[PDB]
């Protein structure tokens, strides 16, 4: 039912294939809901670091799964400039995968 919008641009899928999506049975799906700009969407890929990723979210090298996403800016962004979105960039150090 999700094959109806063009702005899905993250069809690169590492653990399995998007053609093999509804092909084999899965045990326990793990979904994490958040918003990342497309400037560092290539840093989301396993085996890669960056800065926003280096400080808040981490991904395993054996990325069992893959992400679907469309344009957030169209969804939320006031005419005065969306300053409502807040982030954190100045922690002590990095973090291991699957902690917060």
């Amino acid at each position, epitope marked *: 039912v999700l094959y109806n919008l*063009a702005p899905f641009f993250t069809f690169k899928c590492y653990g399995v294939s998007p053609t093999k999506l509804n092909d084999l049975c899965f045990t326990n799906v793990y979904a994490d809901s958040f918003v990342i700009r497309g400037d560092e969407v290539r840093q989301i890929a396993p085996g890669q670091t960056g800065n926003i990723a280096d400080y808040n979210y981490k991904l395993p090298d054996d990325f069992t799964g893959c992400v679907i996403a469309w344009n957030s800016n169209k969804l939320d962004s*006031k*005419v*005065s*400039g969306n300053y409502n979105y807040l982030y954190r960039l100045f922690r002590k150090s990095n973090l291991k995968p699957f902690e917060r």
Partner: antibody, heavy 118, light 109 residues
Framework: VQLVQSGAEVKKPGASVKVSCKAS????????IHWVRQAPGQGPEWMAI????????SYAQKFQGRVTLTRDTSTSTLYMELSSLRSEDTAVYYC??????????????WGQGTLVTV | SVLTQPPSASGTPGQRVTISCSGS????????VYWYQQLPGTAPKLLIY???QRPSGVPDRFSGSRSGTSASLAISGLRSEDEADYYC?????????????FGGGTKLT
């Protein structure tokens, strides 16, 4: 439910101009205004957005940092200041009226425009 | 894009002429298309909403659609008062900048 402009004349080069337009009718804080300039012999270009209430602003890339905006609801005027006027900036200014509560919207009828020359 | 438009579009009374604004990807293909009518000596005015029906009220002589990266509009019944020019408005979403890009100019007799 109508919009009117102000008057303008020839200004000296290397100066700043100020445009104000008045509106009447619907709620001032429940609508959005585009700021456009039309040059003779060429198509119009949109630069600035109006956010009434908090008076928020956003401009284009080629016209940012030289442009000053002031918005208020009690006076219901839009003080639209352009700086560093040159001979290429001879265009008719218009304050539009969007669909409301979104930049993505449809255009209401405009006013009469303000003409400045250098 | 830059909304390329033909410089003129001549015609005769009783004849229908199709005039189009041609763009590119992420401006006409995904974003909506606008058509606005400017009369000489007066304020800028609107011609059409989204290309399905009349904006507020007009006979069905004015109609148009879109295809690929272009938006076409057919005008029939040329009159003396019909002499004006037209503009195309669409969402740009270009690289490092998203200003409302318009078209060039057209001539109707």
């Amino acid at each position: 439910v109508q919009l009117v402009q102000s008057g303008a004349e020839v200004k000296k080069p290397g100066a700043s101009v100020k445009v104000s337009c008045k509106a009447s009718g619907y709620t001032f804080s429940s609508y959005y205004i585009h700021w456009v300039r039309q040059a003779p012999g060429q198509g119009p270009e949109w630069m600035a957005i109006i956010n009434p209430g908090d008076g928020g602003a956003s401009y284009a890339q080629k016209f940012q940092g030289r442009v000053t905006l002031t918005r208020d609801t009690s006076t219901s005027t839009l003080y639209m200041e352009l700086s560093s006027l040159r001979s290429e900036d001879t265009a008719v200014y218009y304050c539009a009226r969007a669909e409301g509560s979104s930049w993505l919207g449809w255009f209401d009828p405009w006013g009469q425009g303000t003409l400045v020359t250098v | 894009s830059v909304l390329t438009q033909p410089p003129s579009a001549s015609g005769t009374p009783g004849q229908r002429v199709t005039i189009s604004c041609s763009g590119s990807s992420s401006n006409i293909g995904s974003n909506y298309v606008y058509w606005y009518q400017q009369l000489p000596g007066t304020a800028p005015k609107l011609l059409i909403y989204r290309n399905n029906q009349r904006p507020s009220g007009v006979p069905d002589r004015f109609s148009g659609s879109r295809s690929g990266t272009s938006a076409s509009l057919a005008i029939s019944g040329l009159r003396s008062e019909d002499e004006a020019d037209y503009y195309c408005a669409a969402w740009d979403d270009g690289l490092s900048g998203s200003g409302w890009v318009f078209g060039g100019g057209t001539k109707l007799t």
